[PDB]
């Protein structure tokens, strides 16, 4: 391990100067180690490995989820004729009479049957999550969570310092999204609107469109 | 799992005693010869020559009964999609239009049909006994040669289980054609036509409705 500012004992910590010393098993050689395991879920090194594919796959779905939830909603506000632009109201586009027209374009995908969508989702997602565990034509014996090869086509993970630097960027962009995708869930249950519709209202009057205007919403009654 | 004494038999886990001359060596050995037809080790070869030819001639037969009536349901104007009515198509003036299409085969002379079949099937079953320009001195049932172009029968290990899959699919098809002859004499309808009527109402469109069909006097 080089002097790379993110790995080793000089690494930054999740409370800054007030952290003191990390736990005795978080020694700073894995990405995003700010030393935050105060509840100590992962003291077993067999168990601590099991949360890291559990964290990284959650990151690699949430970063798709963060962009995926707003990008049809953003283009919907500029005249793209979606059925629904709001992410939590877009699943029910299969029940309308025109089918789920992709991009609001009737000459695209034009899905009709919700069973046919789910029938082919399981037959594909079973195979590729099956391939992620082992095997599969794109690589036989590789890493469980950095396979490379045919999953790094542009060849930008070859130098062992740069590749050890981009793993820190992947998990921090990931942990930004998982925290934010958690935010989409709560401010859709509470506010009931699309997430940029929440944003364009907070930019309208920031003193009165904050979250405290919804504080008395769940009063026991 | 399939050969030797630790093979499954026709009665399964409660099988007890099979016949003695069935050692778990040949395909389809479930030890079911309770009437004891083939105690002769020479005659038992002749039935294995004769079960399989019945098996192969019945697996290709099932896609001649199901398959034209199935294409008739999806928009192909056949002359007779029902399989036991298919021979009578040559006696109508439209002729035997293949796939209901007049610019295909269009048979007219029924005696000229089998007039050339006997010259072919005579020369082609006589090749199966001996000779033939395909395979000269080879196995009587599994020659390979140029009957197996793709080479799914290369190693002798995997070749045993493909022989098992040939005969279990095969015995299943022969079961359906002792079926297929009954359900046409009884109902007078196509086999999937009986299947389309059973899914509409199973408790009424079963065979107990036709239980009084052969009532005397």
């Amino acid at each position: 391990t080089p002097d790379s500012f993110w790995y080793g004992p000089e690494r930054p910590l999740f409370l800054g100067a007030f952290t003191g010393e990390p736990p005795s098993y978080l020694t700073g050689e894995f990405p995003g180690d700010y030393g935050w395991d105060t509840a100590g879920l992962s003291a077993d090194p067999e168990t601590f490995k099991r949360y890291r594919e559990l964290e990284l796959i959650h990151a690699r779905w949430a970063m798709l989820g963060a962009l995926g939830c707003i990008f049809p909603e953003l283009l919907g506000s500029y005249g793209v004729p979606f059925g629904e632009a709001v992410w939590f109201k877009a699943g029910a586009q299969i029940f309308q009479e025109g089918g789920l027209d992709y991009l609001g374009n009737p000459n695209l995908v034009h899905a009709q049957s919700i069973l046919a969508i789910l029938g082919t989702q399981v037959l594909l997602m079973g195979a590729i999550e099956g391939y992620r565990v082992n095997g599969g034509p794109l690589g036989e014996g590789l890493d469980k969570l950095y396979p490379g090869g045919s999953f790094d086509p542009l060849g930008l993970a070859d130098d062992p310092d740069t590749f050890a630097e981009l793993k820190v960027k992947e998990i921090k962009n990931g942990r930004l999204a998982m925290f934010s995708m958690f935010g989409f869930f709560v401010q859709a249950i509470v506010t009931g609107k699309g997430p940029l519709q929440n944003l364009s209202d907070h930019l309208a009057n920031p003193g009165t469109n904050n979250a405290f205007a919804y504080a008395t919403k769940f009063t026991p009654q | 799992f399939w050969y030797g004494p630790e093979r499954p038999l026709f009665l399964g886990a409660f099988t007890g005693e099979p016949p003695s001359y069935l050692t778990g060596e040949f395909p389809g050995d479930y030890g079911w010869d309770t009437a004891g037809l083939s105690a002769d080790p020479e005659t038992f070869k002749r039935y294995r020559e004769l079960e399989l030819i019945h098996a192969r001639w019945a697996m290709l037969g099932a896609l001649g009964c199901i398959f034209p009536e199935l294409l008739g349901s999806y928009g192909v104007p056949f002359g007779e999609a029902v399989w036991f009515k298919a021979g009578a198509q040559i006696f109508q003036e439209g002729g035997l239009d293949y796939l209901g299409n007049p610019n295909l085969v269009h048979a007219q002379s029924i005696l000229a049909i089998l007039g050339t079949q006997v010259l072919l099937m005579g020369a082609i079953e006589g090749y199966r006994v001996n000779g033939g320009p395909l395979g000269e001195g080879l196995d009587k049932l599994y020659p390979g040669g140029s009957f197996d172009p793709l080479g799914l029968a290369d190693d002798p290990d995997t070749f045993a289980e493909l022989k098992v899959k040939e005969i279990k699919n095969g015995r299943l098809a022969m079961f359906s054609m002792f079926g297929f002859f009954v359900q046409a004499i009884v109902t007078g309808k196509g086999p999937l036509q009986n299947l389309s009527d059973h899914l509409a109402n199973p408790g009424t469109n079963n065979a107990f409705a036709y239980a009084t069909k052969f009532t005397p006097q």
Partner: protein, 240 residues
């Protein structure tokens, strides 16, 4: 056990005549070899090279070019510094083998497509142009592409395939590459079993090109497609 009855072995190689001989430049190493080469098109055609002449305007006599050497033909060097003319010879047997196959693979992929497209839509392959110049359809379902969009998609995509096909330097591997293109690994091993697979492709290639040259000529006379010009022959043949 065997018996030779009902046929004859003939002890031979099944040439395109019942009794002629094989030309010298054809040897039986290729699957398609039936000894059919009139007009010497694959004969080893040796050349002769002439030196350049004199332009040399500040001189007394600008003579002529004359003979230098009688070289022999060296085919199928497919060295990839050229990229627009890889083979060392136009008239080399290994290039025409590849040129027969790629003509074959486009033909039988088109002869089947000339019928399945008609058997559903009813539009013959001759008149497939105008009927989608107005509306992009496929199996009765509409498609969003203009015909200007179709050409740029066609030239860019099938360009790179025909560039990548020109990247291999082995004259046999340019014909039968395998690798990714043989996922079933049928002709990858068992060289005798692979050989009768190769004779099956060239026979389906030779029959395809004649059949597609069959479609076009009778579509020039009749103006009718693949199957529409079939029914016209069975029209009068049935009644008369």
């Amino acid at each position: 056990r065997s018996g030779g009855v009902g046929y004859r072995k003939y002890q031979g190689d099944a040439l395109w005549l019942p009794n002629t001989t094989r030309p010298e430049w054809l040897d039986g190493s290729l699957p398609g070899d039936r000894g059919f080469d009139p007009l010497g098109l694959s004969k080893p055609s040796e050349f002769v090279v002439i030196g350049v002449d004199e332009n040399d305007q500040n001189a007394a006599k600008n003579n002529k070019g004359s003979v230098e050497a009688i070289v022999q033909a060296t085919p199928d060097e497919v060295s990839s510094e050229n990229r627009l003319a890889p083979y060392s010879e136009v008239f080399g047997l290994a290039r025409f083998r590849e040129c027969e196959l790629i003509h074959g693979r486009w033909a039988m992929l088109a002869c089947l497509g000339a019928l399945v497209a008609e058997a559903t839509t009813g539009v013959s392959w001759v008149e497939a142009g105008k009927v989608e110049l107005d509306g992009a359809s496929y199996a009765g379902l509409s498609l969003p592409f203009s015909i200007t969009q179709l050409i740029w998609i066609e030239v860019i995509l099938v360009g790179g395939a025909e560039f990548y096909r020109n990247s291999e330097t082995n004259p046999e591997k340019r014909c039968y590459p395998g690798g990714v293109f043989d996922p079933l690994k049928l002709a990858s091993e068992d060289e005798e079993r692979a050989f009768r697979l190769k004779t099956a492709e060239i026979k389906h290639a030779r029959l395809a090109m004649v059949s597609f040259f069959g479609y076009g000529v009778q579509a020039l006379s009749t103006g009718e497609g693949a199957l529409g010009s079939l029914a016209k022959f069975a029209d009068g043949l049935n009644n008369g």
